[PDB]
Amino acid sequence: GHYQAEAALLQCTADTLADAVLITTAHAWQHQGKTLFISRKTYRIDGSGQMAITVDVEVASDTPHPARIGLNCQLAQVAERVNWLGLGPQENYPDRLTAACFDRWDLPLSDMYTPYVFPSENGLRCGTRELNYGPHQWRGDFQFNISRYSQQQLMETSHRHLLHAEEGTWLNIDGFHMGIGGDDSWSPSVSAEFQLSAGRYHYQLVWCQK
Amino acid sequence: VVLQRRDWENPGVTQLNRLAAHPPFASWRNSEEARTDRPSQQLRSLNGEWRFAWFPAPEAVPESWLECDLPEADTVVVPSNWQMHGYDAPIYTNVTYPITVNPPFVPTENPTGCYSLTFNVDESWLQEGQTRIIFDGVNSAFHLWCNGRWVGYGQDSRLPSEFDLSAFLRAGENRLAVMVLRWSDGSYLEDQDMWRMSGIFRDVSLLHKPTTQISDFHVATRFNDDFSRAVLEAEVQMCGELRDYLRVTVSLWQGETQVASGTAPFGGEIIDERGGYADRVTLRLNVENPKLWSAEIPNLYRAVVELHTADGTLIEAEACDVGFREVRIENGLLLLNGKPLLIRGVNRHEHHPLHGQVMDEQTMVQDILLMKQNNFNAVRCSHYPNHPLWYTLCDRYGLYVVDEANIETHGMVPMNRLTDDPRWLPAMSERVTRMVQRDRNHPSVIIWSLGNESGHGANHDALYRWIKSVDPSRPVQYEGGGADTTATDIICPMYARVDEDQPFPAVPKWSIKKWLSLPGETRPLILCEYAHAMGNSLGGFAKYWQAFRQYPRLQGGFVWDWVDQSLIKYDENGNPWSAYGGDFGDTPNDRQFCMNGLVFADRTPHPALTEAKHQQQFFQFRLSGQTIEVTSEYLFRHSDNELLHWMVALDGKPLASGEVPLDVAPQGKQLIELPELPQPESAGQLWLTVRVVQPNATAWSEAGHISAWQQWRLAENLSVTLPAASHAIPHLTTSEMDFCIELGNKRWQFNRQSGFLSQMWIGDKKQLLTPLRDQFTRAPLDNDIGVAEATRIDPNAWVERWKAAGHYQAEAALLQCTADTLADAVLITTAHAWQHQGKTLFISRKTYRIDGSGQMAITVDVEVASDTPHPARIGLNCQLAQVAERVNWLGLGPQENYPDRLTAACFDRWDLPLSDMYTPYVFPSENGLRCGTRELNYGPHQWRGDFQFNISRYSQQQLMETSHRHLLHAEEGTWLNIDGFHMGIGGDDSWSPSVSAEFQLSAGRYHYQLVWCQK
Ligand SMILES: [Mg+2]
Ligand SMILES: [Mg+2]
Ligand code: NA
Ligand code: NA
Ligand code: NA
Ligand code: NA
């Protein structure tokens, strides 16, 4: 039930600090009585206008290791360029990133989408320390993809030509992402060191207008 | 002639008037006594009180000593090493010879032991027959006198020297004089990494044989394809006058039942143009369905060799235990009785902390019992033939033995200088040939070794072929010169790693997996030495066993090594303590490098032993749904003394348990269906633990012995319940130097100058003696120090990289320390940088959130500079004021475990006395860590999270500053080290970086969280 898990709010509190506001949240993702994942976050917004997000996720040890541990949203902005400090310029995944180089990359948005004839998760860049898109800047140590197509549309569309650009831009930012595998394509082929089996995961992001 | 010839500086003279080597003799004059292996009246022990005098050189021995006792001499027990009686110092050196390298010469100051004994010889012994003296071990050379007359000379410290005293003795009182030289030309071949000692350290005895005698015998067992039929073949040699009425009868016994018998006159088959051996006979006995010998089931028969007249007067009988087994290498695999062995081995020196290199039955048996109880099936005699009883015990208890010749020339440059020299072939040949002649009938010996660390010379090739010619029944191995030379049947490297190549010029140590498949390579690979167990070690042990089980031609190895070579010394108060190199005035020396054992010198286990036991298990397990699959790795026996116990617990709390008898054929599988387990209501992880228990006692183990175990995670129910909201709010108080937080009877103090929690109060009683501070260092392990020789400094060693980077002297610099009062909490935020000479090594960012329920949640985020050597640990430490009796934790245990050595540990609720949380390594280091811990309890304190911890009365600082465990003193209170992350310990070897990349702390950014409260 990974694809239909519903979020249940456990905790949502606000605190005032000397120079910031602190929001604390906790969610449980459940499928038919069973808790799959718990996400605990803090959002810290200071006087510089930076929003520091910490995410700590628990993954139930008896649930299949998940494809990713991240955040997503549909931004209103549609911008022409994507600029990042990280591995690139091309699409790269944790078990296929050796060709990719760490540097400052700048590409048109459409280059951040890989037009696989059968649509799937695509266009991830890993080892990214800074990402820029329109007015936004995200900093941390993360994996991301960015495009006009939601994961939902990609998984429901059988051919690339049938994909339609959605309103705004879909952003997926991952603290962690599973290997893609490929030793073969007819059995589990993602090596153990690239499966998300650690049980507890931490990542942190700073979101700001640049 | 004696002082003039100087035979101890001549490699061309290794003996004078010494008798031929042979298998163990007792010259029974009754066949029943031979059969039952009872004492023989013809074999007398001369062990006991002898006369001893020490001299700085042989030239200083008074010529009076030959005929008469010196009253200035003392009464000492024999066998003994004289260093253990205080006469001079034992020397510990590893590679560098303890004498100047000037072959064949030794130092003119050559310590000399003058042994003597006055004893009765009965008349009956001199009227008829031959009386010989047997010195089982004399280190390292000796001249022998009987009643003032010179008998002979012998070298090789580790094999029996025998002399005929028939013409030397008289009825009644006699006197023996033995002049033992510490150093000889034989010392050049005795450069083993051990204490250098001397003396009559093995048994002395007198043997009476009749004139017409069994002078040698060889037992062979050959088999048909399925081992349902055997032929025992016994060649027997005689001395004395040949007569037509003489016969040999070889009879084979199984308990009190005689199974086969052969009788024949002397006269072998034609051998060449000159005939055959008139003085030899070969008996061939048929055995149907022989009970086969193995380490798993050590089935033995008794062979009695009777020399007698045709009409049946017994002249004498000799005997031996016979184990029916075939050892062969076929298609690249080492087979015992047709099945591929998996060697669960260990190297074992002959060492006692009180008696030195003198061995006793009790210590030998203790060693065998502990070995078998910890799933060992093999032993390598590193690096010399052992005390004769060892082989008898390995025959009877069941251990595979590598019997190794007393040859090591490690200190030579290059290592093969003497072994490639034909001038040294005679001395070498005797160390090989006389071992084979002695030990060839012991079924436990399955492999011969040509020695150790002597490079590869032409002499090795010659002696390899000699053994292959003389004894086809056993493979020959030798590691020297690259571990895969023409002198070895088995690729037998020392400390080759599993996945990592070490490409040394001329003598590379390839990854063991890669070595097997090198172009044209076909042999089996069994490491003569691996997993160096020096101090806190055996990290990466599981990696070896995974590889051994996956690759047919990887057939195991011998751990280095069994027992710490530490010696007892006594302090001013007469209290005993363990000493290593340098502690006896011995210099040069190689310090603690003599201690590499799985067990302490008194045979108390190191924590590493349990990891070996677990990895060497003979049952393998898989879980699928409710089904446990048990696979046997026994080759011969069914699991007829085994039951599987299983238990499911929720975070330490038992919920269900049961037991099922195991009925697994060798190499077979058994499926065990677990009953339906009821769901737990509460949150937490279910754990399944299985154990194989032996309901019955064996010769090697007690009833209830656990031989194997395994654990799995079952269902996890993650906690979603909100902790009850408290109506109390913590109160913040501020001063220039402190943030203080008060809640009920609890108080916390944060020093604003340092940025650390400096104090904590429960009922106004102080909980800390030292503030809670980040720690990135450990008191270095022997593996961190990375030294095989005390003269060698390696900039590449972990400790040296840490020191050069300033990890041990980097000091915290405060960047930020703030306090915020929240709705139901006080939030302290801190940030620190550790810097060394301008460079920022680490940054630590923390929050401490103290809420109304009294809990302090600590969140820690650390950055480690990518170009600094990866740190030993990332955690906190403090000195608690409390000393409590017990430590209680939910995590891996009960024993010490580290990230690359935790497979043996199980997750459960453990409760131990505080002293058990400290491992008394003789060289003090970081110790007692327990990993995968979710909850720790000590006095009124509880820490929760996911961490590694150790807890003791000794700080990391004291540990790293103290060279011996006996010099450690309990500090005030208790030092707690709680780690989010801890580096592996390594141990593939102990003289180079050996921590595998996956166990190094290289991630750059680290996160962990702890909740500290009172229960
Ligand atoms: Mg000599
Ligand atoms: Mg050596
Ligand atoms: Na699709
Ligand atoms: Na194997
Ligand atoms: Na050693
Ligand atoms: Na130390």
From Swiss-Prot, chain B:
**Which chemical reaction does it catalyze?**
Hydrolysis of terminal non-reducing beta-D-galactose residues in beta-D-galactosides
Explain what switches its activity on or off, per the activity regulation comment: Inhibited by phenylethyl thio-beta-D-galactoside (PETG), isopropyl thio-beta-D-galactoside (IPTG), L-ribose, D-galactonolactone, lactose and 2-amino-D-galactose.
Q: Does the keyword Ribosomal protein apply?
A: no
Which cofactors go with this protein?
A: Mg(2+); Mn(2+); Na(+)
User: Per its record, what triggers expression of this gene product?
Assistant: By allolactose.
GO CC annotations, alphabetized:
beta-galactosidase complex
EC category: hydrolase
How the cofactor is bound: the record states: Binds 2 magnesium ions per monomer. Can also use manganese. Binds 1 sodium ion per monomer.
List the InterPro entries hit by this protein, alphabetically: B-gal_small/dom_5, Bact_Beta-galactosidase, Beta-gal/glucu_dom_sf, Gal_mutarotase_sf_dom, Galactose-bd-like_sf, GH-type_carb-bd, Glyco_hydro_2, Glyco_hydro_2_AS
What positions does the entry give for Na(+) binding?
D193, F593, N596
Residues reported in the UniProt entry to bind Mg(2+) 2: N589
Q: Does the keyword Manganese belong to this entry?
A: yes
Quote the record's binding site residues for Mg(2+) 1: E408, H410, E453
Q: Which keywords does the record carry?
A: Glycosidase, Hydrolase, Magnesium, Manganese, Metal-binding, Sodium
Q: What is the effect of changing G786A?
A: It forces the apoenzyme to adopt the closed rather than the open conformation. Reduces the binding affinity
GO BP terms: lactose catabolic process
- Show which residues form the site (Transition state stabilizer): H349, H383
**SUPFAM superfamilies given in the database record:** (Trans)glycosidases (SSF51445), beta-Galactosidase/glucuronidase domain (SSF49303), Galactose mutarotase-like (SSF74650), Galactose-binding domain-like (SSF49785)
EC number(s) of the enzyme? 3.2.1.23
How would you summarize the oligomeric state and partners of this protein?
Homotetramer.
Q: Which family does it belong to?
A: Belongs to the glycosyl hydrolase 2 family.
Descriptive protein name: Beta-galactosidase
Organism of origin is Escherichia coli (strain K12)
The uppermost taxa in this organism's lineage are: Bacteria, Pseudomonadati, Pseudomonadota, Gammaproteobacteria, Enterobacterales
